[PDB]
Point group: D2
Chain length 114, copies 4
Amino acid sequence: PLMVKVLDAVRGSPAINVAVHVFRKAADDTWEPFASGKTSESGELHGLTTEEEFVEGIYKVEIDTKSYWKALGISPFHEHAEVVFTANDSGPRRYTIAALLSPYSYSTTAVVTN
Amino acid sequence: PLMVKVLDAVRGSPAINVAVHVFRKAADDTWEPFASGKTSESGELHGLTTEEEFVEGIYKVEIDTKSYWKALGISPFHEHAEVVFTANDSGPRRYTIAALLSPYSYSTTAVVTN
Amino acid sequence: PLMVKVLDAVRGSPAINVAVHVFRKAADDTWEPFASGKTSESGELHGLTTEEEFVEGIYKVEIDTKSYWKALGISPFHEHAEVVFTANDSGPRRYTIAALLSPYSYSTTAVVTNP
Amino acid sequence: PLMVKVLDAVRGSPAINVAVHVFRKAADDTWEPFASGKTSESGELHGLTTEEEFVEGIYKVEIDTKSYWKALGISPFHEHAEVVFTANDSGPRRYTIAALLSPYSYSTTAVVTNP
Ligand SMILES: Nc1cccc(/C=C/c2cc(Br)c(N)c(Br)c2)c1
Ligand SMILES: Nc1cccc(/C=C/c2cc(Br)c(N)c(Br)c2)c1
């Protein structure tokens, strides 16, 4: 129900081995850990959650862009890229959070399909 | 060897049934038709060419964004989106041209892999 | 030393009256409110801070994109757009944080200049 | 009435000394040269045309991104970035064509205002 795809605008490639952490907003307005992983060779992270666990709520997808750039020997601007959104049941069911990274910039979009 | 993927930033969806025309630059500096199609339900166009036909050269991928927006009853800015690039054999072999569309803006990137 | 510029990719216009909240990470790892404002008719927000006040640190610029889209009567995807960065750690710089907004997407960039 | 602004997503800076060529589609469907220039130290190019000269038509703004990246000794993907649009067809407008450049990617947006 939740996939993350990360691309590198400098090299024209998937962004491989990027750490991604997903959080769900709690009752008390704190962010609790939900799911995490590292992007694959294709820049994707699947298997984060199941339909059962992925209930409506506010989620945060934190992409560790700073470590990615440092590993390539490049100095970046951002600490991370943050994507914060509400999951809504009356919308389509599958969510892809995509991000396109540069050292001083990033783009993100949502592809929400049935 | 050549794929095109188009996404809609307004609706958060693949951009379906978008016309795409690919041209190769000729000897005489004109653009000759090479391949075309319409994006699928997943916003993708595959099957444009074969390894045999896709030789080094300058290519132009023209995405008919104006018709896409008009079909959705939205007034757009651009006539089309143009992506012009050199195919180079010493680089990886598979090229994905991706575009993310809004009515007054678009993003494009290349994912070139082996 | 800190300016924010926001554009609307749907309308082809500045994004006007966008709320922006800036935080700075404290010693204790909490996010302390630092400054806030709204974009002008030109999509810009100046006057957030001073060179004296804008010390080294980790800053978070939260752009209230959901409130913007909803005020236009549109239902967007994201809650906000958050831009988090270390500033002034090699001395004072001038930062422009720019953002380009669509209902299901945004991009952001930084322009950093050394006065 | 026509301005071009270019930023560099790698450096976090204006994209300086970027060549830009503007064409206008002629009666005979050819692209006629209209104006040209280079971005300044601020990444901007003004002075391309006048309200008198900038009549209705289909315009192409070609941003010479390959020449920019190569002048910095980098091998980029795209030949250029081309922005094609109808202008002034409901009367005179002011157009800003903005672009944000990376070696394998770019984004472009338009800001259109009615003076
Ligand atoms: N599923 C799939 C497969 C291959 C490529 C993509 C690209 C997504 C994507 C995201 C952002 Br953000 C921008 N700006 C761009 Br242009 C493209 C998606
Ligand atoms: N007028 C003005 C002054 C200073 C900065 C800007 C930035 C514009 C801009 C264009 C694109 Br294309 C993207 N993706 C992003 Br983000 C921002 C505009």
